[model samples]
Target: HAHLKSATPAADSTVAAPADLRLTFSAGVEATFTKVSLSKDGTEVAIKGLETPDADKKTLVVTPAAPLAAGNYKVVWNAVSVDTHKSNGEYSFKVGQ
Candidate 1:
């Protein structure tokens, strides 16, 4: 199973409003079954395009159609490792005013 080492932008950091969210995995992942979602209090945010970085398939990036407001948000992800094992994880962070 794949495991997440850490997430970029961190659990709490005032970033310059990233266009996407990037996640780093502990191992290589299969692009097909991989999924990422942005949510606010459980409601899913509509991201424009979500994908794995070509430079590193272990990294998943998501592009939101618009900038997010200051609030607590959660990123949920699930993926299958190259070895065909499934793993999932979620993290939360807040945006600043």
Candidate 2:
């Protein structure tokens, strides 16, 4: 029952004013595996915060400090289930004018 369900901005594409990054899983994720990062060409961008939406522990929302510019970006994430099984992945996307 542990799996990645969906992500906003759809991954590997450009998005307009993406206020937050959302990830849905089949089951609740472990706190230790909550590390999610956003970067532009490998440079870390400042993230404002991370939280679960409306007590939906299966979903993670990452808020960025500012709007992204036109360029390529990547999201690197890892999560663990209650059983301690770890899952990790990276995706790339582009922003255009």
Q: Deviation in angstroms for 90 in model 1? A: 0.9
* Residue 7's lDDT in candidate 2: 84
Q: On residues 1-97, what C-alpha lDDT tens digit does candidate 2 reach at each position?
A: 3578788877777777676788887887765467788898778988887777655478878888998777778888887766777788878777676
Q: How many angstroms is residue 5 displaced in model 2 relative to the true structure, after the best TM-score fit? A: 1.8
Candidate 1 regions with alpha-carbon error over 4 angstroms: 14-16
The global C-alpha lDDT for each of the candidates, from Candidate 1 onward, is 0.77, 0.77
Q: Against the true structure, candidate 1 has what lDDT?
A: 0.77
Q: Judge candidate 2 against the unseen true structure and give its global Cα lDDT, from 0 to 1.
A: 0.77
How far in Å is the alpha carbon of 48 misplaced in model 2?
1.8
